[PDB]
Every structure is written in structure tokens, then in C-alpha cells.
Paper text:
In [name] the multifunctional heme enzyme [name] is indispensable for activation of isoniazid (INH), a first-line pro-drug for treatment of tuberculosis. The N-terminal domain contains a heme b and substrate binding site, which are essential for enzymatic function. A covalently linked “MYW catalytic triad” is formed by the conserved residues, Met255, Tyr229, and Trp107, which is essential for catalase activity (Jakopitsch et al., 2003, 2004; Santoni et al., 2004).
However, on addition of the pro-drug INH to WT [name] samples, better quality grids resulting in higher-resolution cryo-EM maps were consistently obtained (2.7 Å, Figure 2E). During refinement of the KatGINH dimer no symmetry was imposed; however, despite this, it is apparent that the two protomers are nearly identical, with a root-mean-square deviation (RMSD) value of 0.4 Å for Cα atoms when superposing protomer A onto protomer B. However, there is one notable difference, with protomer B displaying density for residues 206–221. All particles of WT KatGINH selected for the final structure classification contained a b-type heme in both protomers of the homodimer. In particular, we observed three potential binding site clusters rather than a homogeneous well-defined binding site. While the density together with the bioinformatic analysis is indicative of INH binding sites we have not modeled discrete INH molecules.
Author numbering:
A (entry chain B): 26 to 740
B (entry chain A): 24 to 205, 221 to 740
Write the structure that this text describes.
Amino acid sequence: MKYPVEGGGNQDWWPNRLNLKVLHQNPAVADPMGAAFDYAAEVATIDVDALTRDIEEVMTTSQPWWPADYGHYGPLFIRMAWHAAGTYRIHDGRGGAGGGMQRFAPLNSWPDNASLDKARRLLWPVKKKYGKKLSWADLIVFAGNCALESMGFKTFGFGFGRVDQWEPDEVYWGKEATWLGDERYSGKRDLENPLAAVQMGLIYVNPEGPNGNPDPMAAAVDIRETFRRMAMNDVETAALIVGGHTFGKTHGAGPADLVGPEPEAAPLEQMGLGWKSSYGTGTGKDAITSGIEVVWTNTPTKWDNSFLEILYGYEWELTKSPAGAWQYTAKDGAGAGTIPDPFGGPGRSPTMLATDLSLRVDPIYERITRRWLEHPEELADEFAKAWYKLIHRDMGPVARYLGPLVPKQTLLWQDPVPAVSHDLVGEAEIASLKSQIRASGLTVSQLVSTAWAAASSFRGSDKRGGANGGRIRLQPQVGWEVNDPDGDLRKVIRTLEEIQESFNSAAPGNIKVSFADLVVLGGCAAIEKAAKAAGHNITVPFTPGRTDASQEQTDVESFAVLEPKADGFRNYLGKGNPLPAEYMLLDKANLLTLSAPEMTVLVGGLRVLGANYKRLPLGVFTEASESLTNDFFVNLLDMGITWEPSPADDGTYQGKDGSGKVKWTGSRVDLVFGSNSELRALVEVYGADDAQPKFVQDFVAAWDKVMNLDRFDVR
Amino acid sequence: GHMKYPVEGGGNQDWWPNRLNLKVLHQNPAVADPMGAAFDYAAEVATIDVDALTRDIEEVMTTSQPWWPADYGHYGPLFIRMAWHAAGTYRIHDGRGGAGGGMQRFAPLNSWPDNASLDKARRLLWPVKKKYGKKLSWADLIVFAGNCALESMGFKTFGFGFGRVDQWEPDEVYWGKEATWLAAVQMGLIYVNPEGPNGNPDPMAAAVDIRETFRRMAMNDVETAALIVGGHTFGKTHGAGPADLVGPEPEAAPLEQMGLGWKSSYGTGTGKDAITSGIEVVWTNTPTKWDNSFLEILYGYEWELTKSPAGAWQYTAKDGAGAGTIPDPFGGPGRSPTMLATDLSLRVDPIYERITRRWLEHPEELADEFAKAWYKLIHRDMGPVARYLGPLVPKQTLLWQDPVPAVSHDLVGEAEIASLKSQIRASGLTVSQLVSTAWAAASSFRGSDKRGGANGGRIRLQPQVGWEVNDPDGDLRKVIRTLEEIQESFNSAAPGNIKVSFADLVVLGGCAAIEKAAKAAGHNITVPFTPGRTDASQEQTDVESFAVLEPKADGFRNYLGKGNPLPAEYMLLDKANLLTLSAPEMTVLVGGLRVLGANYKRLPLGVFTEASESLTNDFFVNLLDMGITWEPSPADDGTYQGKDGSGKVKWTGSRVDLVFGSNSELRALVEVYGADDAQPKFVQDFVAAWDKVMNLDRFDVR
Ligand code: HEM
Ligand code: HEM
């Protein structure tokens, strides 16, 4: 069967066809805020004291549709807050709280996101007051941060500026067709590269050990691997788990078969709420969220060093949750009736979750926690730093943090860049520098490839990398395989440093130029020289302001995830990619926040400009040496050429003319633009007889967009 | 192994396969357009040189290509088949299909079994498209190639009108639910199976399928017979070899083929060995010249079932009957006469037979009917005649175009509009009446074929005035009479030659009601108004052709008829897509029309405000209230009642009303206009959307 349009569509006949709809995600037509809504200018003016008062009033006020445990919705807001930021993953930077996707993405219905719909609904009275001055993404994490502040914990700081989105970001979470699927492992615990979760729908880890096996060692291994795949080491992981579970409790009062469907498969009358329980009242003393009934600490609404005292004070035999789940309880009934009830009444025995004994059984976590057992100040500092890192991972450079709560110091995981310490070049020194660069003896190909390598490391997901920082001469990026440290990127870098030294030593006044600015300027000078060679007199815009980071300010391991395993624009293909070359090219274009016409012009320009990996002729459908001409598209649509795969199986094709002599050679990413019906439509726009000026100006616009992707200090 | 990557089609539809897909509302965004935002195609094609354009197409047709050799040397019949396959997907019941957007070059259509060998046809035209570029769209070129092919082989066509704008992503259209390529349900074919119903070679049974499928695209018996007789006067059918040697369709073909599909491994694979459908029929002895030889052959011999070399039912002349009188595309022996299984329908069928026998002696009538039918075919979804461009548009108008009179007087502006608004408000008509009438006039528009709308003043004419959604035997006649009284009162006391038309008064009364409601709510605004509409008469309105425009479900008026295929939620998004509205525009329109009182039969279903006839955002603030517990009505009416904190029913709503508070994507938009200090934004957005809807069919001012 097939569904008309609003149920399904074209992906049914050909399930594995190239999907170009990912390149126009979040269109401005679907934005209800108009094309003049500058979120930064709005959120820069809110009153944080009033917002804190409103959030505290919401936390301390119980609501009939979701009775508050202990008369406080703080712990629920903390859980919501990190579950928003717990979907981040360093593989590609997707996920996290930077987009507020917890509302309508394919989560909002994940088994671990149970009872978080009520948490987001409880904050409507706050969002109602501030409207557009405060986004949902900002409010979700600020609610948890303010809950931590109100429950006695002094946090590091906070930064506003997470722009809302009005369309689910299509993120690959796994190949498992059913919830809690475990088809993402090979041999031992070897979680597949794209994913960062043990199962499907689980944020971090099943709270029963691997696949329901209540073994603290294996659970510890899973915790370590899962947190490692989200930029967290052992100390930060232990701090996060200890601090987070200091507050609140779990909800496993009744059997889980009485819980209704998820919000996305719920009746209309529920108003977008899901998991409606039929046990008892269904809320409050009879709430069911995960099936485990554990209260870790005897003061679950205050911050103190009581989680570790309880953890190391008992023996933790194994028992069963009243909903039928695995959990640990203090042996010999020690400390019975010492844990208070959420809604008044009898006490509880001390219970620990199956993954909470990992912190005292695994040797690494055991040493860390035993250190924190008698040194609560270290735990407080570590938790503050880890929480700050967790909330602001995918928010980008420090220039994007708004509001008055931003901390003053810099952290290495932010990829800090130094502030501008001189006066920027403008409109005359730029011309002189471009003249010097074009007279420096570097070819168009070298400059263009160096500029693209510097700038095409940006990810639109977590806004890491980019041309700012001048990090292409630093160790992680100067040695990448795609960058070819052998044949180039050393002559170019040395020449650019010589030019920078010569200019700075003689520039008037206190005007200097940074290395990154000079790299981008050389790229632009090469572009305009090639355009002049083609026959067009144009000027590539340049925005100075970049600064040079140092080696000590660059984390080599943190940058290892930005290395491209496949760069279709440079016609480079590494090893171990999950998909063919064209799909990887679309993924790269989506990461660069490009559209389809922009991708087309960038590919067609970089092909003829000589910015190919190893300067290979794969895709150079031109006879002009380094001229920004309209030749890639003209020769791609020519049917005087018959394409057929190379006799030596390489993933490369050769195009023979009418005389049978091989004229062109190409790859998957070169022929996909002439084969795909949606892409050939764009290629035919620039392949027309009168499209060379339009192609040149479009290429310059796309190039300037790519160079300025990471310029958040001027935008 | 399920749950593929989002880059290869993964997404939320894999988890919940029957959820509201809001991506149909942001379809074909401006960011995917390579031409930019300042591109005006109407100002580009108007400067084209048709004389130089026909000169290129002719030398393209008369120049064989090594990769697709030409049959008899001319590529004309192939272009005729392509042009009609482009326009042959039109559907009257929703307007989707046709050559309006040139979707034949995109994924759904370019890989249909009937569109075989048409990927080669669209590529032979690349040299023409290369010369002109943005001055000539693919959609315009595809049909102009067929028109110029008809002209080149001796047929004088009616005319041609440019103006089809290219779109850059395939249009999602429901072609049927079969999940297998190739009646109770419609298969993957264009009109009918060439071998008869379900492969049964009976021509009498194929006649009824032809009649039904052509009637479902606004063609009667005379136009159906003329189209088939004229189209099959040219060209031949390609069935030279078995069909198992044909490769995959273009969407499943490898990259070597550069977007071409159906690569044949039989013989050379092209030309003398071409395999497209597998029937191998040459209808006429002069397949590259227009003449009255199709009907002469059809009525000149007796026919007989045989099989094509590929294996397929076809008719050949009895006992020889002039073998070798039909030339083959590439020099060789002649062939005996041969007719398709659906071409005998025009002979053995009581209705078609009389028409074809009449044309057998009067070919001039056949030529005239074919010209008219072809012109109607390639211009079904152009819309109003004001959208035709180029120096080839015929002067005289046609009934199927929904003609309206030209403006024959001075237009009101900015001084009579103010006075007209002042007496519409003081005429006794309530805000609900005016708003409902204005919405009823302008909601008939559908953006697929650009039919209907406020222009023409057809809300008072026979088809629309009697629609169930329009007047539940109520105010519509009273509003129409009052507006006409105002019209004849204003026209007599006019300053000079300034006069106003009835449709203009309908839209202006809607705008005046909006202004009155906004002033009641506390905002002083002005709804933009662009005069220029005219009034059509009853004879210029075809009652039967307007019957398909009747809304079976209007989510904005909270009306649900009978015979809808999907629940009320999905039909609302379908109509919003037909009105070319985005999700915020749909949201503001739904939230504003409820409090204005535009509900069908003035029902309280979804009126979440206490003081009606006032343009507030009370719908959104009362939808997001969590003090209201929604639960289905005791009677299975499909309505829900939301009780207060006590056991008192505070509000009542329907599926369309409650889906905005339930769908997570739609609730995001509701929380924008439902927030505090968000009422001025809501008023401005509602006014912008209302003005956009009022001016949907105004192609005479663009
Ligand atoms: C940054 C790390 C973490 C933080 C900040 C955190 C915080 C919290 C808080 C405050 C609660 C109480 C919710 C409430 O009382 O409504 C909670 C519940 C819970 N946590 Fe975490 N936790 C973290 C890590 C983990 C990990 C690694 C697991 C592994 C299984 C886990 C599993 C659970 C479960 C199953 C619940 C029960 C929720 C319910 O039943 O309603 N958490 N968490
Ligand atoms: C019930 C109606 C029709 C049926 C079943 C039908 C079927 C067919 C089939 C099966 C072919 C063979 C194509 C191939 O094998 O390459 C064909 C060819 C053709 N058709 Fe139709 N057709 C119909 C109506 C029309 C109409 C309305 C037109 C034009 C207005 C038309 C114009 C043509 C032309 C010109 C060709 C020749 C193609 C060529 O020479 O390459 N046909 N038709």
C-alpha cells in the first residue's frame, strides 16, 4: 500500500534513492517568525532575575495533572535538561540541546523520554510570559540549571542563544526497527561508529546493565563507552552520574503493561501527552516512567554529599522492582525506613540502580568516587564543570554565548581563539595583500585547496572547526590525509607566514594581519585571478577579523573527530564509509549548511579550479588550466561522450568520445550530477549557453558563504 | 537492516507510518531554486523569439542521433507522444498532474512504464534548451516541441501560450496504492492498457476504460476520439524484441547511463531494434505527414488478433489485405496494416463509431476537433487566460477557460474604497456573514490547475451558490442581495466613470469585516485591497466543470462532508496545500476564522473565545490551557468536549480543531501566537494570510 502525500511518498518505490530534501531543512517558509527575527537581539535583553523567579515559582507549585514529588519539580527539570543534551555525539556533532529537538523529533517518544512531555508542558507558563524573547531550547536547559541553583548547588554559568527550529532534524539513530534494539554491536562492546547509544531509544545506557543483565562490571564498561562517545572522560562521567542522581527518584510503582502509547501514537484528546497510565490515579504516588522504584538519597531535593555515603555504606544485594525490573537494595535490611516518601507516609530502604554500583565496583570509578567520598568540594567542582560542558557542547564558539551569566574564563573544549589585539586591514591593505599573494608564486590550485581545507572542517551541527583560529598549521589538521601534508600545505603555509611577517613588519600604525585571515585572503585572491582568466572582473568579498590559535589552545584528541573520511568537494574518499560516495557528499553538504544549487556550483567550480585531492584529473572536465569557467557542467551534459566503468575496478569511470579515445575520467560524485534527475536539473541551469556570468557570481556567493560559516563574532 | 540513513530516505515515517506529514506545506522552497528570488519567468519568456525557436526545434527533429536513431528521419512523432504524456496526467478531481510544472522529468513520472523511451526524447531537446537557458523553461519546451512537431508535419494548430514555470523538486501526488508497477484502482499507466482492460484484447471492453479515463480529465466523446485519431496519425510503436532484455528504469539505472533508462540488450538496442512497449504497430502509410489515412485504414480492412515479436496482443488485417503497404522506419520491407487493441474501440463501439464514420468523409471536422482538443489538452492547468504569454496566444476565448469580462471602467481607489467600506459596515451584515461569504468566494481556488477563486464573481452563480458548504439554506442569498443593492447604489452615484463589480464588493466586504473585528479587538489596521475583479455571467460558467471544485471537506470552515479518503486532519493539510499556504499561514487562518465566526452552520465547534466577532488570539491561548480536560463526546459524533476544572463543559471541538494542540509540529506554531504580548503579531500575520488568500487568482495584476 502507499499513502497519498501527507502519509508518505516517493521514497517507497526506490527506498535507497538519493534524498536531496535534507539540503533544504528548516526552510524560511516554515519559520513562523519571519525573515527579520534576530534571536540574539531579543534574548540579549531579557531579565534573568524575573526569569529565575518565574522558574522557581513553577518548580515549587504542584499541578493536578502531574503531582510534584516532594513538592518540587526540580529533579524532573534536571533530568529533562540533560536528556536534551544527552543525545549529542562526537561522530558528527548532531544531537544535543542546541536545537531543542526534544519536542517533535523522533524522540519525544523515546522510551527514556517518558514523563518528559509533562516536564516540557509544565514550563508553558514561563514561555508564555516571554514569548519570542526566549526559545524552547534555551528554556529547557535553563530550567534544569535554575533547578540546580535553587537546590543548593552553585553552577558554573549559563549562556543563552540556542535558536529554535520548526522541523525535526533527521538524525540517524540506528538501524533497529523496534525500540530498544541492540543491532549496533560487533563481537565485544564495539558500538558502531555513527551511533553513541547502547540501544535504540536509550539516551545513554539501559538502567539494568547490558541488555537487562544486572552486572556492575559490564554496565560500567557500557557507561564508559557511551560517555566516551559524547566527549566525556572518566572523571566527568563519574561526576555527572553522582551529581545527577543526588536529586530525585525513579517511578516504577505499578506494572508497565498499564501504560498507554507514546505521544506520537496517542489519541488526540491527550493534547500531545503520552504514556497515560491506568494504574491507580496514573500520576503521583502511582507514576510509572521506567519501571524502577529507587530513591537514591534521603534528601532528594537538596544538594549534599549523601549519594556516595549511601553507596559506600551498604552491601547492595539484588532484588526486583515492583514493576518487574532489576535493582539493588541494602543487604540485611540496613537503614530501613530512612528514605522519605515522595508524597508522605512510610520510609524506604536504601536502593541503588544497577548502573550506580558500577561507580564503586569498576576500579577507575571506584578510585575517583572514593576520592570524592571524603572530599565533597572536588565533587562539586567536577560536577559544575561537567554540567557546564554538557549543556554548552553543541553551542559553538564562545562568541555565541549571550546573557549576563556567561563565565569569564575560557575552556579548552571550546576551541578558544585569542581576541583581536590590533587593528584590522581594510579596503587598501587588503588590495596590497592580494597583490602580494598573487605575486608570491603560489598557483591557483594551491591557494584554493588550502583555503578550502582550512574552511571545510566546519560542522553546522555543533559549530566546531572552521577557518577561524588558523588551525590548519597546527598538529591535528596539518597532518590529515585529505590535506596532503606531503606535496603541499607546507610550501603554502611557509610562504603565507613569510608574507604575513613582511606585511606586519611594515604596515602603517597598529594594523596587522593574522594567519587565518591571510589564508582566506589568498583563497579569495586566487578565485578572483581565475575569474579574470575566464574573462570576468569580479571581487570576492573578504571580512577580516580572524585570529590565530596556538598549539596549546588546540586539543589534538578533540579535533580527531573533525577529520573528514570523505570530502566529495575535493574528490577524496577514505576508508570505512557506511555509504557510497554521493551519499557522503550530501552528508558533507548538509554539515556545511549548503543548499543544492550551492553544492552544485561549489563542486563545479572546485573541479575546474584544480582543488582536487592529489591533483587528480577525476572530474576535471575542462581544457583551461585553472580558470573559473563554466566547463564542468557543459561537458557533463554532453552526449557525445559515452561513460563506462574503468576496466580496473576502482569506482572510477572513463568517458570515451565518438573516436573511441578516452577523453574524460570521473568518479561517483562527478557522474551523480549528470545522472540524478534532481541534480541534472540544476546542472542544466549553469550549463546553458548564457550562464557563465551567473555561474561565476553564484560560485563567488557560495564561496563567501563557506568561508564565513564560522564568523559568529561578526554575525 | 531497516531504519536507513536520513540521507537515503530515513526519517520519522519509518517509526510512525501514518502521521501528519507537514513537509507537503513547505514544498518547493525558495532555497532550492537556482534562479534566485528576483527571477521573473513571465518577464523572460515574453522576450523570446518564437521564429528562431521553431527554427532550432525543426533542425533538431530532422537530425538523427547515434544514441537514439530517428524513425523515418523525423523526431516529430516522438515529441508529440512526449508532449501528450506530459499533459496526460491531469486529474480533474484535484487538479494535480499536467504539464504545468514539467514533472515528467522528475522521479515519479520519468520512470513510469508508459514513459519509456521518453527520457531519450527529453534529451534530444537539450541543444534547444542550451541556447535559451532561463528564457525558456523545460515545462514550456516539452509541450512546445510537440506543438511544433504537429505544425512541421502539416497540421495547423490552434495556438500556443507560454508561461509554465519550472519547479526544482518533484511534486508529491497520490497516483494510487498498489506498491507494484501496473477499474477499481488506477495502475501505473497513463490512460489505459494498450492491450485492453487488464491485458484482455477485447476492444469493446477497452472502449469503456478509454471513456472513463478520458472523462476523468475533462474530455468528452468527441474530444476523446479526435485526440486518439490525430495522435496515432503519426509515428509507430516499438516492439522489435522480447521485453526481458530491457534494463532498469532511469531511477534504478546505473550511473554510466547518465539518467537514461530501459537500456535494451537486444541487437543494437536502438533504432531498428527499439523496444518501448512491445507491440510494434505502424498505424498509417505516411507516419510523418498529417492526412486522413488513419480512419481510411481502420475502416478499410477487417482485423484479427496476433502477437508482437515481444509478445503482446495486437490486431492485423485479415487474410493479408494489402501486405507491404506500410513503410518501416529504417529502409526495408513493407508491413501489413496493423492497429492497436484500443484503436478498434473507435470502430466497434456505438458512440465512437458514429463520430469516426462521420470524420471518414469530412476530414475538415476531424482537423478542427483535433486542433481544439490538442489546445485544450496542453493548456488545462495554465489557469486564467491572462497567464498566456508569447506571440502565439489565440485571440478568441473558450468556455473551459472560465473566461471573465475585461475591466471596462475606471477602478476605485483609496477614496471610494473608504466610502464603500463605510456602507458595507453600516448595511446590517454581521462580521461573520461578510467573512464567511468572502472566504467561500475565494476558497474554491486550488493552486494545482489554478482554477476558481474570487475573480469572476461566481459565488452568486448556479454551481457555487448551491454548494452545501456555502449556504446551509441561510444567509448567503441575503448577503448577495445586500451587496448587489450596495453595488447598484454606488454605481449610479459615481464621480466619473468609476464603477465597482460584485466580486470586488465581496472581497472588500470581507476586508471591511476584518477591519471591524480588529478594531473591536483593540488594533487599528487596514486590510490591503487590490481592485480589478469582474463579474462573469451564467453562460460563461460551465456548471458541470465546476462540480469538481466543490469542497468535500473544508477544515477552515470546520465542514466535513462525505466520501473523504482520510480523517479530518489530513484533508485540512490537503486543502492548505491546494491553497499554497505554509504551516504558519494555515495556523493563523484556522485560529482567526474560528473566532470570527466563519464556522459552517455557525457551530460552536472550535470557537474558544468568549466575545466573538473580535480578532483575538483567544483560540491559541485557550487551546494550550492545561486546565481543560478533553475527552470524546458521549455520542460518536467525532467531536470532543473539554470540561473545566469542575464537571462543566467549557469548550467543544473537532479533530481539525484539536490537532493543533496535539501535533507536536503544529503545537509549536500555536505556542508562538498563543504567548503573551503576541497579539499584534497574530493580527498582522492573519491580515497577511487573508490578503494572500484573497489575491490567489489575481494573475492580471502580477
Ligand atoms: C549527566 C548525567 C545524569 C544526570 C544529570 C541525571 C539526573 C537524573 C535525575 C535528577 C533523575 C531524577 C528524575 C526525577 O526524579 O524525576 C534521574 C532519573 C533517572 N536516571 Fe539519570 N542522571 C544522569 C545519568 C544517568 C545514567 C548514566 C543513567 C543510566 C541508566 C540514568 C538513568 C536514570 C533513570 C532510569 C532514571 C529514572 C527516571 C524515572 O524513573 O522517572 N541516568 N536522572
Ligand atoms: C487510449 C489512448 C492511447 C493509447 C492506449 C496509446 C498508446 C500508445 C502506445 C502503446 C504507443 C507505443 C509507444 C512506443 O511503443 O514507443 C503509442 C505511440 C504514440 N502515441 Fe499514443 N496512445 C493513446 C493516445 C494518444 C494520444 C491522445 C496521442 C496524442 C495526442 C498519442 C500520440 C502518440 C504518438 C505520436 C505515438 C508515436 C510514438 C513514436 O512514434 O515514437 N497517443 N501510443
